[PDB]
Amino acid sequence: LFTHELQNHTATEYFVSSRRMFEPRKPTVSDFVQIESCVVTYVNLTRDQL
Amino acid sequence: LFTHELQNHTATEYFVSSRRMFEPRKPTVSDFVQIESCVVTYVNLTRDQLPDVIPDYIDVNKTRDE
Numbered sequence: 763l764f765t766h767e768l769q770n771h772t773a774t775e776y777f778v779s780s781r782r783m784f785e786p787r788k789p790t791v792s793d794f795v796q797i798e799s800c801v802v803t804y805v806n807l808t809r810d811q812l
Numbered sequence: 813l814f815t816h817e818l819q820n821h822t823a824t825e826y827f828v829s830s831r832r833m834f835e836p837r838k839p840t841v842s843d844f845v846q847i848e849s850c851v852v853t854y855v856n857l858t859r860d861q862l863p864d865v866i867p868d869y870i871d872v873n874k875t876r877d878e
């Protein structure tokens with residue numbers, strides 16, 4: 763998952779592509795993993811924007 | 813994915829398995845992804861038959877309004 767473009771224009775496009783081949787596309791929910799442990803490296807947000 | 817039988821009697825049984833082996837099973841929503849582009853090879857269909865072809869599919873929109 764990468765953020766193409768920047769927050770300079772209030773549009774952060776979250777797309778997932780193969781590390782071997784740039785193929786941008788919006789990820790599917792079934793394909794993530796849920797975690798109980800959080801570290802500073804994770805992006806903070808509330809449930810509203812999920 | 814493959815189509816057991818043909819539309820000769822309007823029964824195209826849609827199943828999925830391994831490419832090597834024969835492990836028939838109805839395709840599931842978790843098996844696939846969505847794209848915004850279409851071609852002729854893609855079989856074209858309406859929304860109401862999605863549960864018909866994919867019982868694993870659940871249309872929350874059309875069930876809540878009921």
Ligand SMILES: *[C@@H]1O[C@H](CO)[C@@H](O[C@@H]2O[C@H](CO)[C@@H](O[C@@H]3O[C@H](CO[C@H]4O[C@H](CO)[C@@H](O)[C@H](O)[C@@H]4O)[C@@H](O)[C@H](O)[C@@H]3O)[C@H](O)[C@H]2NC(C)=O)[C@H](O)[C@H]1NC(C)=O
Nearest residue numbers: 846847848849850851852853854855856857858859860861
């Ligand atoms: C559901 O989606 C399918 C896509 O997965 C559809 O397949 C598309 O079907 C349409 C028509 O149904 C095709 O568009 C037609 O293309 C012909 C080609 O014209 C050329 O050939 C004629 C005759 O030789 C010639 O006179 C012309 O000058 C051209 O050289 C057009 O003539 C038609 O007007 C029409 O535009 C698509 O090409 C086809 N998809 C692809 C990728 O080719 C399917 O049709 C959809 N379901 C239904 C019921 O239509």
Ligand SMILES: *[C@@H]1O[C@H](CO)[C@@H](O[C@@H]2O[C@H](CO)[C@@H](O[C@@H]3O[C@H](CO)[C@@H](O)[C@H](O)[C@@H]3O)[C@H](O)[C@H]2NC(C)=O)[C@H](O)[C@H]1NC(C)=O
Nearest residue numbers: 765769774798799800801802803804805806807808809811
């Ligand atoms: C996501 O949220 C976490 C927690 O809200 C953010 O990390 C937190 O950042 C604050 C601000 O620096 C840390 O508090 C500070 O801790 C240091 C000691 O490390 C102390 O010197 C300061 O006085 C202050 O107390 C907090 O410890 C830290 N906690 C964690 C778990 O990271 C994080 O930056 C946020 N990141 C994003 C992308 O939103």
Ligand SMILES: *[C@@H]1O[C@H](CO)[C@@H](O)[C@H](O)[C@H]1NC(C)=O
Nearest residue numbers: 871872873874875876877878
């Ligand atoms: C789902 O979409 C239908 C129309 O297709 C609409 O009537 C209904 O209110 C929608 N429900 C939700 C929860 O989006």
